[model samples]
Target: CDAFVGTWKLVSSENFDDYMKEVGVGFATRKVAGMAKPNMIISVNGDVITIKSESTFKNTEISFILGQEFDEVTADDRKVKSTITLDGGVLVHVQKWDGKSTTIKRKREDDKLVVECVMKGVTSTRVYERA
Candidate 1:
């Protein structure tokens, strides 16, 4: 039930800075992110998957599984209680972070996988293609 189980690369983005800012990334970090290309690597075992995301700017790794809740701590040190599940073929992740709730919805559309994220009064929708 690990929906993301392939290699992925960043193709292009718009207003990435704003999205990072909303996530509490510092301006200097955003500047670094502006100059880097990120990659997402996934490893799956049964229903569990480990997401290894890396870039010239920064690197992060996370693990998740379908229908099970877990604690996720951000690089910024915020803790989130989260769970991921499959709604049809789409991956649905709901999280409670710092007393606020957020959701990340992902689905394959055309040649890309779409991510619709709602957090902290902002909606950040991103797309990724298999590499």
Candidate 2:
């Protein structure tokens, strides 16, 4: 069921800082993260999916099965009750922390990956292309 299984590099973003701020990232962290372009490596084994985002500033990874919810230490260091489900080829990623919920929608586009994130009623875009 995993159609997306490859390496990708973040090449563009829109309103990243604003989105991160709304997503509860710290000032210092958001500043650095906004500047760093991360590379994402995605893989799947059985029902488990793994995503690793690595950059010069920091690295974050997640491993979980689709349609399951688990405690996730997100990239920005927030502890989120994360649930990811596949809906019509899109990875509907929902994360909740401190009563705050964020939805990050991932779509596979040819050799690219599109992340449209909604946090606190704000929308941001991160475009990653296959590497």
Candidate 3:
């Protein structure tokens, strides 16, 4: 919790388009999201932890308890069941829908926050710097 409670700005992305494709995101969304940089804000209050991603195109936020399942609407509007848990220092987020699942791991790397999203065999990495 102490490691990630801050506002972070996206700096770089890699293999993101392929990752979106594997998640079944539509072409238009893939195109737009590829160009937009977003800020990730993380905080905790009592038992609820909040993670917010804000951008010019879309802003999404989730305040959840660790290890609890919640209904989530993706930025691309997919309805899925999601859960987040902390493993060592990494925040492990998993989403499931239609018998398909994807995982995202967020962890601090030196002075940066690194996010890795994995779907099937496609993996995307987004790097962020503290703001």
Per-residue error (Å), model 1, residue 66: 1.4
Q: TM-scores across all candidates? A: 0.78, 0.94, 0.98
Deviating ranges (above 4 Å) for candidate 3: none
In order, candidate lDDTs are: 0.74, 0.89, 0.95
Give the winner by TM-score. Answer: 3
Model 2 TM-score relative to the real fold: 0.94
- Tens-digit lDDT track for model 3 on 1-131? 88899999999999999999999999999999888899999999998999999998689999999999999988888899999999998999999998999999999999999999999999999999998
Task: Name the weakest run of 10 consecutive residues (lDDT summed) in model 2.
Answer: 1-10
* TM-score-superior candidate, 1 or 2: 2
Put down candidate 2 lDDT per residue, 7-32, tens digits, no spaces: 98998999989999888789899988
The whole-model C-alpha lDDT of candidate 1 against the native structure comes to 0.74
Best-matching candidate per lDDT: 3
Name the candidate, 1 or 3, with the larger lDDT value.
3
Number of backbone collisions per candidate, in order? 0, 0, 0
> With candidate 1 superimposed using the best TM-score fit, by how many Å does residue 88's alpha carbon deviate from the native?
1.9
